[PDB]
Structure formats: C-alpha cells, structure tokens
C-alpha cells in the first residue's frame, strides 16, 4: 500500500504506539515486513545513531514513513519486471528469487564496514544503501513480500540467513554472503551445507519462518547499543514489549534463539508478572527439542552464560556440556568459525576463569566445592571430547592454542581423588567418550599428578618430544 487501516496509528509517539502498531500488524493477513522494519530502523536511527530529536520518544510521523515505503516498493517494482517471470502457481522461480537479490545486492554502497551496527533495517538500506549479511536476507524477503511473493521465507541459522521459496519451501537459494570475502554461492541451494553437516547449516534443521517468525527476526536484530558504554534503555524496553507480544501469540514457540534474548533481557529488566529468565531459557532448549531435533547451540550457551553470571559453577559446566554434545554431531568446517571462537573462549578464558575462583574459596579450607563434584570434572571432559569429536569430522586439523595449556590448567583445578571417581566407559558419574583424542587420554586424566607434557602430545596428536 500503504493500506489504510495500516496508517490510522500515525504519528507513533511512544514505544507503546510501537507495539501497538505491530500487534496490528500482526493481526493482519500478512504483517508488511517493510513498514515495520522502516519504523524499527527510524526509531533506531534517532535513539542510537543521530540523538538529535527534541522529545523523549523520536515522533514518527506518517508523510515521513510512507515516503521511504513508497521509494523501496517503488525501487524494487521498477528493477524486478515480474512479466518477464512466469510464476508457476504460487511458486516463485529460482531466476525471480536471484533476480531480487540481485537488485538488493547491487544496490548497496560499494565500500563500507558490512559489521557496522544499525545497519540491518530497511531504514538503513533505503537512507545509507548498506545492510549486514542477514539484513540482505531480510531485504530480499521484504522485497518479495512487496512483489506479492508469498511463497519466499526467511530461513535462518545460528550464524547465516538464505531464503527458502516453493512448495512447502522445499527450495532453497543463498542470497548473501557468510564470514567475509568468501564463495560468492548466491543462487546457490544450501544442500551441500547441510550433506556436509556443518554447523552453519544445522544438518537442515535451520528455522524456516513464516512471516510472523520474519517480524520476530527484525525484532531480535534491533540494536540497543549507542557505543560500547551505553545501550538505549528506550530501544531495550521497546525490544522487550515486543518479543513478549510475540510471544503472547505465540510467534517465539519455534524460535529459540528469541527466548534465549528475551531471557536475557528480562535480566536486566525483569517486567513485573513474567516468567523468570530461567523458564525462558528452558523454554528455548525445549523448542530446540521440540522442532529442530536439538541440534542447536545457542540454546544451551544462553543458559551456560545466565549460571556463568549466577556463578552456579556446577550447573554451568552441565550446560557448557550439553553444548558440546550438540557439537559432537556435526564436522568442523571453515565456515563455523564463529562457533569455534566461542568454544575456544568458553574452553580458555570464561570456564579458567570460574574454576580459578572456585580453586581460591577451596584453597582457603571451604568444602562442598564444586571442584570437589565429581559430575563437574566430568561435564569438563564431555565438554573437551564434543569439540574434540566435532573437529574429528573434518579433513585438516591442526587447531592451535588454547586448547592444551588450559585444558592441562583446569584438568589440575581438581584433585585426584575427585578425577578418578569418574568412570569413563567404553562402548560397546558416567561419561563415554566419542572422540579418538578424549578416548585415548583416559588414563592420563584419572591420575594423582596430571602430566602436562603427556596430555599435550595426545591432545595435539604430537607423536614426539624435545631432542634435548
Ligand atoms: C548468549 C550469548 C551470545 C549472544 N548472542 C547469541 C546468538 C544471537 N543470534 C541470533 N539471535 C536471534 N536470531 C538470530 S538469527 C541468526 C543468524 C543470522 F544472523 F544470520 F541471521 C542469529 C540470531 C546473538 C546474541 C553470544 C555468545 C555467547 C552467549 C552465551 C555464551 C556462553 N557461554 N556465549 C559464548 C561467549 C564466548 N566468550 C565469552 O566471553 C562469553 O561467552
């Protein structure tokens, strides 16, 4: 349009005139991408980017709004001719899904930072002409939606977007790029992705959104931060008002990574009469179980980060273990670097860092530690052997650092008497390991004195020592 009934709220003067206008939206047949995400990224751009307006909330007002819709609608109908697409019946074909793309992706400025913040809106691609990797994805499914495509999804993973178009969305088409300076795989499908059991694909139980799961994308990617310092608490609590009317309706029951945010920010901002952080983090790894056979991460890694906060020592080591054994079923590729630099944090700085300060409370005299929990030290192994096991599935090793010097640290953070209570069967606490590395370590991690230089040449499959 605009329609008409999609203006009656204008001027929006607050964030609940925000909210109200998406609960509008989502009312509605198909709520229209590209309006709210103009106002998302308008109201981001005066609360976080340019703070200049004269008022408390920035007034959106309807001229202002419907000329940057009328100029997306109107670039993308001029550049996509559909006549020159036969659509098959409610199918959009291959050539029509890369065709936009294309006049997305050709429309973006030549050079700038593609990590900037604030640049994931249709705002920032109308005014600035420059998108992040996953605001092309958006873009391209907004443009589709304005073109009358209502076969053409969002699909998204842990760390990528692509589209999904056709029957059921049975094909899929890469339309923006992953990592940075990579393979330029655009029109690709992803089912190399998904046969190769990367990560980045989700062994294809990635999300596939319909449009009310679009419009809780666009919310999770609003952008609080003004610097490094400072988030907008304006833009947090509009965030929050909107991922709980999703939530009400039930638009986050397939979307993990969105509770895991909600929680997260019902920390900082408990809104009085809703569920603790704590259920909504159960409730994320629930509907990872529930729709995409717990193959996610972020699930757990969200509820590893609230204990690591809390400091409950023991149950975030479970949780960091229950990542791992996710972890364990794909094979490391280049692609899942983003992963990798996560479990290599988590593995040498965030868990050295938890166990450091349980070691000095121990060191003291103070029992019941978690250093002395038997269940700890093996969650600790579970944790090294899933990414030991995810490496195992690749071509090349050779994954430096961290990985032993910490891991022979926090391996001597216990004491032999807790280490050898563990008991690590093969097969054909309790802990069977699934990696070669893990496995043959065994021994070496049950005994009285930890032999670092040991414990090194098994876990860097060095096979000799020092001449001299
Ligand atoms: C919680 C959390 C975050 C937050 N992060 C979670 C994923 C969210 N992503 C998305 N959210 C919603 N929709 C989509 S859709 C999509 C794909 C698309 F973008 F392509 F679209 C991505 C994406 C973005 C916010 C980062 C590192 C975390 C944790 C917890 C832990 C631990 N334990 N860690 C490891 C760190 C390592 N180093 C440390 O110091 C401390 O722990």
Known sequence: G??????????????????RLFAAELGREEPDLVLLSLVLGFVEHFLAVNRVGLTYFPVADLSIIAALYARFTAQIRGAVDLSLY??????????????????????????????????????????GTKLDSSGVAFAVVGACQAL???????????????????????????????????????????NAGVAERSWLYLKGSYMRCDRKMEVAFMVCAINPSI???????ELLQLQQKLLWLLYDLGHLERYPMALGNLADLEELEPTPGRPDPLTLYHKGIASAKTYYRDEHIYPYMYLAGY???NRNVREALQAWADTATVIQDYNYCREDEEIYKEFFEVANDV??????????????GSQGSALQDPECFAHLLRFYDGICKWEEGSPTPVLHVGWATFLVQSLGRFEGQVRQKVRIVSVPPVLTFQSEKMKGMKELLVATKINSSAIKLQLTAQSQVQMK
Do not use: M
Not at 227 to 233: A, E, N, P, R, V
Not at 351 to 364: D, G, H, T, V, Y
């Open 2 to 19: 605009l329609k008409a009934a999609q203006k009656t709220l204008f001027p929006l003067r607050s964030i609940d005139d925000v909210v």
């Open 86 to 127: 036969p659509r098959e019946g409610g199918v959009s074909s291959r050539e029509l899904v890369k065709k936009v793309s294309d006049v997305i992706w050709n429309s973006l400025s030549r050079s700038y930072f593609k990590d900037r913040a604030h640049i994931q809106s249709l705002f920032s691609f109308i005014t």
């Open 148 to 190: 009358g495509l209502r076969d053409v999804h969002l699909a998204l993973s842990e760390d990528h977007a692509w589209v999904v178009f056709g029957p059921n969305g049975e094909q899929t088409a890469e339309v923006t790029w992953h990592g940075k300076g990579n393979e330029d795989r655009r029109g690709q499908t992803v």
């Open 227 to 233: 610097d490094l310092h400072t988030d907008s608490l």
């Open 307 to 309: 204990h690591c906060r």
């Open 351 to 364: 868990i050295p860092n938890l166990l450091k300060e349980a070691a000095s409370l121990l060191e003291a």
